Write a protein that binds this ligand. Structure first.
Ligand code: PGT
Lengths: 24, 217, 230, 230, 230
């Protein structure tokens, strides 16, 4: 992996995952 | 020639990911004429044009997804066989991939234009009849998406082969889903057209992430 | 026309792999880069053709500091890479396959571009077939075509990555005629391998990598004589 | 004992693929505000009634994949075991799991779900026991009665589905497609339990076994894969 | 004390790759099996073990045709096997890994589960690592435990599969000690590998196939003469 690749797929996925709940 | 090598093959897998996607969204709508007709007062034998000519509710939403994920899947096949890096280690630069992505995007952006203006009221005014400010401005930020995700997916196609293909294409499918879901929450809401910069940030990310190795520090 | 690597290095996670690497090639010599596994053959060889980023050092081609330049530019200067596994274009004609190299060859005019490829199919004995999809080729007949790709971009220094990648030894002497043929046309070639019994027959001077160091500045005759080879 | 090894490996992931995935659906329940209300902290096991069996495949095939494509399952194969003896081992560790989802159907989850809507003050699921002889005058509640008796049986079928096509078609494939196939046969339970309930309620003249059929079609597939190829 | 697999044939979807192959090994010999890639090296060899099922012929071990019987009882019958890559259980202790096969030895008692554990642990001079995780070994140390979890099944004829497959050639002198040590106790070792000019130093019959045909066999000194073997 990388130092950032295991840190983008956490933050950017969390911004996807909270955003589903805005229009749920 | 080498541009013809891509667009005869990504379009050979554009249509294959199209029909498996046009069929997977019938079985989330044909459920809703059986799981909702007994629950929310929708009649029975009107489905033959409700599910039949109801397709521009969904075909305005999957052509930017099928052109995106069609191109992403066929570059994942093209890196992991190391056919990119005998072509990359010849004289042609990264620009052959970017020039090819616009040409295959015209064959979708024409279809996404004819659907959104001419085949829309072919159902919205000749099939919405039964036979048995609130402006939206969402049609321009959906044609502009097609010439935009194809410009940024060609630098996000690396496969780093110690990690698999599906983990490599995770920050592309997940980044498209973030863009293509703000543009519904910012359609129902009321500072409308303030979401045009949201369209412009990921266009600036489409430029920043595309050239990130040609430049010095 | 001479590569000159000087003082190459690589480090990750606080751990170091490469230090004090100063290999060179010349126009007309076959240079090995053999050694044990994981101790820095691949990391040195990917440093010369920069799929991996360089941390320290410089590589030059006739006083042209091309070290920061990625694979976009080293094709324009004389470096031609050849991958390990099957790197042919997949479903496309063999005559059409050589033409895709010859698009960005703009110093050579486009009326011998359909004519040099007619000549270039001759010498590697591939002109038996001219229209064939890349599916229906075998691991020996295809090997004469992947070399023909990077040869068509007119480099100075072809760079091979394990051409002895587990084939039958009657095809070793098939590849050995090709390497002795593309050293005649002024092309220097660096080569890595693990088949060290067959690398030391095609060579003029080799090197070695044992966790960073260089213990093999000289000829294959100095290998059966030297003590620190274990 | 290595029967306490495959069972430990499955039980290592079947909690780990659950706690990651329930809390993924826990953090998506910040929709009611759209601030001190722990409504999602209080209705955690209500999802684990239904959000569990699609994790009983993704996780019994995720974690068994890294037991199989590390070239290990073909060693226990070649050291005395039968194909049935490894199938008995996941059922040796299915019985601490079908009982664990049996417990939340009566004791844990509807006790808090009773006070779920009550705590946020400013299919009528009650239990297995209390819902038994609740539907004495039938209907849709008779179906979701009979759906809830052997909804925990589907977890034991699920680890027999996960072990079915790990010996048949899907073994010589990379780890990425074991999640996509491991989720597309898990996503399809949404589009199967939520139609063949109202199918049998409307059209099905055997109105009782309309819920047995989703946990029956994933048993014909499992008996085809391990009884046809060899 | 002798197996024989006569008339081995196999087709891949109506396409013959192996057809009418036969070989005879005894107790106390090392027998090679070589050839060109993709022509009958593996597909003959993997059908003797039983990863792929036969299409004809008969695999006979001491007048007992085991051809219908897959790998899941051949190790109980007396055929050992070990893969090409790392196959330590890599989550378990070494002493637990060593007696992992010893538990399915149902003709033995419980105090003998320490006997063939402790005799075989100190036999390969690796007894100083009774408590060790699986991912705490090296390439010249992983292989010595991996052999030790094949004698524990008590086989008659062990079948290796290219052991020296990526080691430096000044380390194959110690693998050949392990091969001779297994050759010392009388258990026959049938190997297949691609580097032909390395395994001829330790072999005694060395069958050679090509295109699914037996071509030449016998002894290594009486095989370097034929025109068909080139
Ligand atoms: C609110 C959300 C709106 C947009 C959110 C944007 C968030 C980040 C923007 C997009 C970043 C992900 C795009 C692809 C990531 C990496 C792809 C890539 O080009 O390769 C590397 C690119 O490197 C990175 O992933 C790091 C990029 C950003 C680093 C951290 C983010 C900085 C963002 C600044 C502000 C962020 C504010 C919110 C954060 C989301 C990553 O892998 P690697 O470096 O291990 O291997 C390839 C090698 O690098 C080739 O050169």
């Amino acid at each position: 992996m990388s130092k950032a690749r295991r840190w983008v797929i956490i933050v950017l996925s969390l911004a996807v995952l909270v955003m589903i709940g805005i229009n749920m | 020639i080498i541009i013809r090598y891509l667009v005869r093959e990504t379009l050979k897998s554009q249509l294959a990911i199209l029909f498996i996607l046009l069929l997977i969204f019938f079985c989330q709508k044909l459920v809703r004429i059986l799981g909702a007709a007994v629950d929310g007062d929708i009649p029975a034998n009107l489905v033959l044009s409700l599910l039949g000519l109801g397709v521009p509710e969904m075909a305005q939403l999957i052509l930017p997804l099928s052109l995106f994920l069609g191109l992403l899947m066929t570059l994942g096949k093209l890196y992991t066989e190391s056919e990119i890096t005998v072509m990359h280690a010849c004289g042609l630069s990264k620009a052959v991939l970017v020039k090819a992505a616009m040409i295959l995007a015209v064959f979708t952006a024409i279809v996404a234009a004819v659907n959104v203006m001419w085949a829309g009221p072919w159902s919205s005014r000749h099939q919405d009849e039964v036979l048995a400010r609130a402006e939206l401005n969402w049609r321009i930020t959906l044609v502009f998406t097609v010439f935009m995700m194809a410009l940024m997916v060609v630098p996000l196609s690396v496969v780093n082969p110690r990690q698999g293909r599906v983990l490599s294409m995770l920050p592309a499918m997940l980044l498209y889903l973030l863009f293509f879901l703000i543009q519904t929450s910012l359609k129902s809401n009321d500072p409308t057209l303030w979401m045009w910069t949201v369209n412009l940030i990921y266009l600036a990310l489409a430029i920043v992430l595309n050239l990130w190795d040609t430049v010095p520090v | 026309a001479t590569l000159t690597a000087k003082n190459l290095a690589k480090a990750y996670k606080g751990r170091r792999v490469v230090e004090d690497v100063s290999l060179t090639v010349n126009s007309g010599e076959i240079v090995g880069l053999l050694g044990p596994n994981g101790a820095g053959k691949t990391t040195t060889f990917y440093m010369v053709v920069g799929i991996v980023p360089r941390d320290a050092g410089n590589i030059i081609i006739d006083d042209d500091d091309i070290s920061l330049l990625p694979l976009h530019a080293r094709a324009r200067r004389g470096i031609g890479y050849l991958p390990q596994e099957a790197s042919i274009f997949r479903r496309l004609s063999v005559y059409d396959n050589l033409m895709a190299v010859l698009q960005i060859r703009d110093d050579l005019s486009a009326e011998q571009r359909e004519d040099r490829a007619n000549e270039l199919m001759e010498e590697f004995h591939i002109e038996h077939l001219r229209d064939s999809m890349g599916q229906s080729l075998s691991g020996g007949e295809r090997r004469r075509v992947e070399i023909a790709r990077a040869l068509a971009a007119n480099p100075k220094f072809i760079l091979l990555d394990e051409p002895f990648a587990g084939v039958d030894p009657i095809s070793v002497i098939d590849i050995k005629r090709i390497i002795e043929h593309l050293r005649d046309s002024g092309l220097g070639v660096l080569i890595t391998d693990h088949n060290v019994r067959e690398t030391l027959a095609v060579c003029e001077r080799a090197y070695i990598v044992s966790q960073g160091h260089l213990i093999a500045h000289g000829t294959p005759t100095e290998i059966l004589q030297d003590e620190h080879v274990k | 004992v290595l029967d306490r090894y495959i069972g430990k490996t499955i039980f290592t992931t079947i909690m780990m693929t659950l706690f990651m995935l329930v809390s993924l659906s826990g953090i998506i329940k910040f929709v009611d505000q759209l601030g001190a209300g722990m409504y999602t902290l209080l209705s955690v096991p209500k999802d684990v009634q239904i959000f569990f069996p699609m994790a009983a495949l993704l996780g019994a095939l995720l974690g068994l994949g890294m037991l199989a494509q590390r070239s290990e399952l073909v060693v226990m194969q070649a050291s005395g075991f039968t194909r049935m003896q490894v199938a008995l081992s996941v059922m040796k560790t299915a019985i601490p799991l079908v009982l664990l989802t049996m417990a939340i159907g009566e004791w844990v989850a509807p006790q808090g779900e009773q006070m779920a809507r009550n705590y946020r003050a400013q299919p009528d699921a009650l239990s297995i026991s209390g819902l038994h002889n609740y539907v004495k005058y039938a209907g849709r509640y008779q179906l979701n009665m009979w759906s809830k008796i052997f909804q925990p049986l589907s977890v034991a079928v699920m680890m027999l589905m996960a072990l079915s096509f790990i010996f048949g078609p899907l073994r010589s494939v990379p780890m990425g497609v074991r999640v996509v196939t491991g989720i597309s046969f898990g996503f399809v339970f949404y589009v199967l339990d939520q139609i063949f309930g109202p199918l049998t309620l409307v059209y099905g003249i055997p109105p009782i076994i309309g819920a047995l059929l989703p946990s029956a079609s994933f048993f014909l597939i499992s008996l085809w894969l391990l009884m046809r190829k060899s």
